[PDB]
Amino acid sequence: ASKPK
Amino acid sequence: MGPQDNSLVIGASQEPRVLAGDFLRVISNQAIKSEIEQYLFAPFIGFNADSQNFPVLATEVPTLENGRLRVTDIGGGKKRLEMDITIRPDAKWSDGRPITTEDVAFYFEVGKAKGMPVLNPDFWERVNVRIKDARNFTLIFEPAYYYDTYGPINTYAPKHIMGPEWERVKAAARGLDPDKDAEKLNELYRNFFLKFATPQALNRGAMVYSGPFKLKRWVPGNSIEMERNPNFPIKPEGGESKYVQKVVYRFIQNTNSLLVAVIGGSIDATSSVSLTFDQGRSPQLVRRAPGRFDIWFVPGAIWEHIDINKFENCQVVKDLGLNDKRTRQAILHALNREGLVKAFFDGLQPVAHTWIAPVNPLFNPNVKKYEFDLKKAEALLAEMGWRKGPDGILQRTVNGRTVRFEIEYVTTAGNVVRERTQQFFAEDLKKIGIAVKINNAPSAVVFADEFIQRASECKWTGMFEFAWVSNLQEDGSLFQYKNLNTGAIMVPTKENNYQGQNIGGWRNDEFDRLTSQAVLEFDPERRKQLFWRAQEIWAEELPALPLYFRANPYVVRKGLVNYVASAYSGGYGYPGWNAWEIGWESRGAVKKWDQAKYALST
């Protein structure tokens, strides 16, 4: 699950 | 001030919306939240800067060699993977209670709950757990994917703290149908995590911690202060007293203001979510570094891109034709990406044409590229009926209604390079008749589930720019409609209980077939071949607009050791994965890692 920034 | 009181001040430009209790990351999956949580929650198996699994709260890394890993053939070229983990006898929560397999069983029960808005429904369909005793358990993956042994492995939550409320939540959930009562069910589960994840709740002691640090206080909008957790069992060389006893994250939303604070000297180190590439090499910072700080640039799987709402149930989407690949191709041809990276970063952060960063061997450098060409953009849009209105903006008729090509463009407010990017692109888009309506907000707002995971409810209706930070567990799930091995739908909507991360609503059956097979391919080359074909299709359809691949700049005060990051350290490529050994050399902290070998030259 890629993470947002 | 650092070695003085033996503390560590970390600067960040984004703040977690919630913290600690949102252990499945369904409310917020912000990179900053995950980074901070490394200090507060430790995994059973970690992933170090050398890209190796290593034991943290577990006794040892499971392997075929020590019999902790067992792979069995279940037919058709598919496998069952069993992974035996033993929790250390001294693994303890910050309140003194032991970390046991009951905490593991609890984690699994919550993740398995029907209608839980999980980020990865595929994982939750094929992974299970078997409990042997209070400290021995086995994770079962069937079918097994090529990345299942990739750390970190953190599958537990504090049952003695959250369990009682969970039982009440489960009882209430029995009266709700995941289909007809999706909205109410989602609210029920969100509220469960919120009771243990807001500032006031946490400040009143709602949670306990398993990492090298525990929460002291969260001053929302300003800082998160943590103190040493004496119950954490891994002691750094020389004793924990020689390492930092307090860690404080300071939040400054405007990146230029954060840059000024960093130059000033009161911040010991920067977060993976802080300054942008251009700021890291700006003269005002570089010229103030001598004898004070070291500046490093670490490449990672950080993909700056623009998501596009393609949900046909939102009339705005159909009006603008965002569901037609020609529209997306037209927009990309109007984005002068090469000009942008050259001017903004001297080309050091390259234009991206796919979603997988070069640091990952699956990266395909041969996919279709969309060069900057306003003529091509104009031709594509004209083919779809658009004609300039008297204000210079394209217009056309849809369902008998006159529509104008004014598209929403959302990004993180305060991130100066992104605000500049919007302006830069807007100037060219206007030349071909596309107007941009800027609608920015803080990371804590745009990355909260109710915004980012609600495009199907038309919460955001056009372009949404941000970056995905990825680990090595690449499955293309960001763009799968459904994983064919588990049947799990990855597009979050009321119909699937808001699960998944395909936030723009793309569906390509061939892409799903290729990626679903690829994750089952244990041969690196065949796996790459399948992912390369998937990327070719992806590039033709442009479900999202790729912008550029990033490298994180880190500013670290001289004297601070072991605050090191790599492309995939801690899984996602950030510092803090070894938080128990970060300290000041003048305090006796022993250097064990060096940033140079993991960063770009010089």
TrEMBL record, chain B:
<dbReference type="Pfam" id="PF00496">
    <property type="entry name" value="SBP_bac_5"/>
</dbReference>
<dbReference type="InterPro" id="IPR030678">
    <property type="entry name" value="Peptide/Ni-bd"/>
</dbReference>
<comment type="similarity">
    <text>Belongs to the bacterial solute-binding protein 5 family.</text>
</comment>
<feature type="domain" description="Solute-binding protein family 5">
    <location>
        <begin position="82"/>
        <end position="474"/>
    </location>
</feature>
<dbReference type="GO" id="GO:0042597">
    <property type="term" value="C:periplasmic space"/>
</dbReference>
<dbReference type="GO" id="GO:0015833">
    <property type="term" value="P:peptide transport"/>
</dbReference>
<dbReference type="InterPro" id="IPR000914">
    <property type="entry name" value="SBP_5_dom"/>
</dbReference>
<feature type="disulfide bond">
    <location>
        <begin position="314"/>
        <end position="458"/>
    </location>
</feature>
<dbReference type="GO" id="GO:0043190">
    <property type="term" value="C:ATP-binding cassette (ABC) transporter complex"/>
</dbReference>
<protein>
    <submittedName>
        <fullName>Peptide ABC transporter, peptide-binding protein</fullName>
    </submittedName>
</protein>
<dbReference type="InterPro" id="IPR039424">
    <property type="entry name" value="SBP_5"/>
</dbReference>
<keyword id="KW-0813">Transport</keyword>
<dbReference type="GO" id="GO:1904680">
    <property type="term" value="F:peptide transmembrane transporter activity"/>
</dbReference>
<keyword id="KW-0732">Signal</keyword>
